[PDB]
């Protein structure tokens, strides 16, 4: 975005810089280990309240 002004004139050179830098990492683990003991011909249970 450049402009020109024919009515004024700046003194010297100015640079006015600005820097920004960012880095990031993440790591989520979630583990489950379930046992159930049961029988061969096991049926469901109907309680359900």
């Amino acid at each position: 975005a450049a402009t020109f002004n024919p009515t004024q004139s700046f003194l010297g050179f100015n640079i006015f810089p600005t820097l920004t830098a960012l880095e990031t990492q993440g790591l989520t683990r979630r583990v489950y280990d379930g046992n159930v003991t049961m029988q061969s011909g096991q049926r469901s249970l109907s309680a359900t309240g």
């Binding site: 029988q39 061969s40 011909g41 049926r43």
Partner: peptide
């Protein structure tokens, strides 16, 4: 008629009950 079939879920047993000809048909299936 047709042969009687009895299925047991606990033991996974199939029981066929009928005339000897109707029972040999299920036995080959």
């Amino acid at each position: 008629q047709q042969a009687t079939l009895i299925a047991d879920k606990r033991t996974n047993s199939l029981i066929v009950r009928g005339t000897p000809e109707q029972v040999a048909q299920v036995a080959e299936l």
